[PDB]
Amino acid sequence: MTIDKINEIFKENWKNKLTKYEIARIISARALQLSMGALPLIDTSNLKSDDVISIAEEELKRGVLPITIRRIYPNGQVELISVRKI
C-alpha cells in the first residue's frame, strides 16, 4: 500500500498490458511511416488485404515492431514497454 491498495493493483495490472490508446497510436504511426516508403517487417505476400493499416495490424499482432512506449508517471518515474516480441 504505497498510497492505497487499489492504486497498487492498478499499476500492477497495467505493468505488462497495453491500453487501447497505445495500440491505436502504434498502429497509426506504423501505417503512416509504412505509406511513406518503409519496408514491411513481415512477408506481405499472402495477406488478405494489402493496405497499410492491415499490414500494420498484422505487424503488431506478431511482435516484430521495434517500438517502445514511454510511460511517465506523475511523480517522475519512467516505465518502458517494448512491443518487439515483448
Interface with another protein (CB under 8 A): 2-4, 6-7, 9-11, 14, 20-21, 23-24, 27-29, 31-32, 34-37, 40, 44, 49-53, 55-56, 71-76, 79
Residue 68's beta-bridge partner residues?
Answer: 82
Q: Taking the complex as a whole, how short is the minimal distance between the CB of residue 65 and another protein, in angstroms?
A: 14
Give 81: exposed, middle or buried? Use CB within 10 Å, 0-12, 13-18, 19+. Answer: middle
Q: Taking the complex as a whole, how short is the minimal distance between the CB of residue 24 and another protein, in angstroms?
A: 4
The residue type of 31 is A
The number of beta carbons lying within 10 Å of the beta carbon of residue 22 is: 15
The smaller minimum CB distance to another protein, of residues 22 and 63, is found at: 22
